[PDB]
Amino acid sequence: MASETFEFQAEITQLMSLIINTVYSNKEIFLRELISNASDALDKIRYKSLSDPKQLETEPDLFIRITPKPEQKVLEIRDSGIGMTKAGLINLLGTIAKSGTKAFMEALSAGADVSMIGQFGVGFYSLFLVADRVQVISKSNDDEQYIWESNAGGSFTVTLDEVNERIGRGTILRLFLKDDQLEYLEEKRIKEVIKRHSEFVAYPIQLVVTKEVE
Amino acid sequence: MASETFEFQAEITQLMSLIINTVYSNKEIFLRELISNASDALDKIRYKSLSDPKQLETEPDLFIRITPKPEQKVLEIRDSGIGMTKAGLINLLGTIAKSGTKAFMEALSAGADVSMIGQFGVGFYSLFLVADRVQVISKSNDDEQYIWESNAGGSFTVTLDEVNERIGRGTILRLFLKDDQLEYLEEKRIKEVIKRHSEFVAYPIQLVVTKEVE
Ligand SMILES: COC1=C2C[C@H](C)C[C@H](OC)[C@H](O)[C@@H](C)/C=C(\C)[C@H](OC(N)=O)[C@@H](OC)/C=C\C=C(/C)C(=O)NC(=CC1=O)C2=O
Ligand SMILES: COC1=C2C[C@H](C)C[C@H](OC)[C@H](O)[C@@H](C)/C=C(\C)[C@H](OC(N)=O)[C@@H](OC)/C=C\C=C(/C)C(=O)NC(=CC1=O)C2=O
């Protein structure tokens, strides 16, 4: 339906500017970050299901799933983790000041490698190394499916989802890749980054490949 | 939103009963039929674009795409063809009597092989050889995305689509496969049926495969 618009916390806008603009080099670590967040969301739903097992029923399979959509120059990273509510997307992804946002920027400007970003708890923002636009589509058991959207600019939108496949539970990171970074649409490149930086993951990592029949 | 319910034309209910119940044997021809309908829908949008090229812009790529979803025991056949309107789904897929429906039943009962079903213009109904439920999800340039749904019973539903991925234009056949017929979730089996009965197709046939990264 209609979209609500929210302004970014000053520093989060700052951080997004550093990342999408400068940085360079170790760009491929965005995938380790997103997979690690997916893994954390999966840990969370699974831990919650220990004392409330009905939670797993909206989507009984625990997985991480990567889907290149070359036509749209899009890369999606999906998990059937715990998902986020409207309130969650609004507060934790923009309006409330992340503790480590300022400290990481200072660390960065002082010599720190971007790959450290995850230890400051703002690794989600690494996605702007390779993308200039993101939709975070999420479904918690405690709320409806919503779309959060940001182009790195000063504000983001949150919209009730009536346009995307129903996920039973969890989250899709829909990355609109930059033109210089289309290599992350390639199967071999994807397997390679995964093997190098994400060897220790408790959940299956699926790769969706589209092949033409001969 | 809310669902409108429609009764099937008597004979179409008859036909669906023959097919989902008896038949046996050459079940795999359902795929030749669906691919051929997809090809016809693609011919139609392409022919229409000859004198109105803006038509292709809702989805500039012409393709047929097969997606097994083993978790849900579902097989989807998609095309970016001309799609159908609400009016279309209601009239041509149920309420108005198909010319060849009765003649095919007589041919069938007289010895005719099911594979003939396409020459009687009711091949769409072959899908009930392998499925006991279908959603036909379609998007014409002249209307909104709708879901038509039937379980072979006497009536079907038509619903405004707010729950599925937006297709830009065209149609998805979402088959809920029977338990005896899960083989059509398998990549090798799919390639094999395609090669045997659908060698001459003017459009790319894509197969979406989900593989676990090691
Ligand atoms: C330790 O928890 C983590 C925190 C606190 C974070 C807000 C907790 C969050 O709300 C309470 C849920 O507990 C958790 C299930 C949601 C995810 C992991 C999402 O990812 C998904 N579901 O796949 C992630 O991205 C869409 C959301 C924001 C991530 C931030 C801004 C970041 O930069 N790094 C972080 C990574 C983390 O693991 C981070 O700050
Ligand atoms: C020659 O046109 C065909 C006819 C007339 C048919 C109603 C024409 C239709 O409306 C006017 C559109 O022109 C056409 C674009 C839509 C499709 C081919 C759909 O398939 C898709 N889009 O992928 C198909 O199935 C969802 C719709 C009903 C098919 C029937 C009941 C059948 O059993 N066989 C038929 C196969 C055909 O090719 C048939 O009767």
From Swiss-Prot, chains A, B:
Reported effect of changing G83D?
A: Abolishes ATPase activity
The domain of life for this entry's organism is Eukaryota
Q: Which GO terms describe its molecular function?
A: ATP binding; ATP hydrolysis activity; ATP-dependent protein folding chaperone; identical protein binding; unfolded protein binding
Q: Where in the cell is it found?
A: Cytoplasm
Q: GO biological process annotations for this chain's record?
A: 'de novo' protein folding; box C/D snoRNP assembly; cellular response to heat; positive regulation of telomere maintenance via telomerase; proteasome assembly; protein folding; protein maturation; protein refolding
**Keywords from the named record:** ATP-binding, Chaperone, Cytoplasm, Nucleotide-binding, Phosphoprotein, Repeat, Stress response
* Binding-site residues, ATP: 33, 37, 79, 84, 92, 98-100, 119-124, 171
Induction of its expression:
Expressed constitutively and induced by high temperatures dependent on transcription factor HSF1. According to PubMed:2674684, it is constitutively expressed at low levels, however, due to the specificity of the antibody, this result is unsure.
The consequence of A97I is: Abolishes interaction with SBA1
Chief location:
cytoplasm
Q: Cytoplasm among the record's keywords? A: yes
Q: What is the effect of changing G170D?
A: Induces a total loss of function at 34 degrees Celsius. Abolishes interaction with SBA1
> What GO cellular component entries does it have?
cytoplasm; cytosol; nucleus; perinuclear region of cytoplasm; plasma membrane; protein-containing complex
Q: What does this protein do?
A: Molecular chaperone that promotes the maturation, structural maintenance and proper regulation of specific target proteins involved in cell cycle control and signal transduction. Undergoes a functional cycle that is linked to its ATPase activity. The nucleotide-free form of the dimer is found in an open conformation in which the N-termini are not dimerized and the complex is ready for client protein binding.
What else does the entry mention about this protein? Present with 444943 molecules/cell in log phase SD medium.
The record's comment about this protein's domains reads: The TPR repeat-binding motif mediates interaction with TPR repeat-containing proteins like the co-chaperones AHA1, CDC37, CNS1, CPR6, CPR7, HCH1, SBA1, SSE1 and STI1. CNS1, CPR6, CPR7 and STI1.
The annotated subunit structure for this chain is: Homodimer. Interacts with the co-chaperones AHA1, CDC37, CNS1, CPR6, CPR7, HCH1, SBA1, SSE1 and STI1. CNS1, CPR6, CPR7 and STI1. Interacts directly with the substrates GCN2, HAP1 and STE11.
**Protein family membership:** Belongs to the heat shock protein 90 family.
What protein name applies here? Answer: ATP-dependent molecular chaperone HSP82
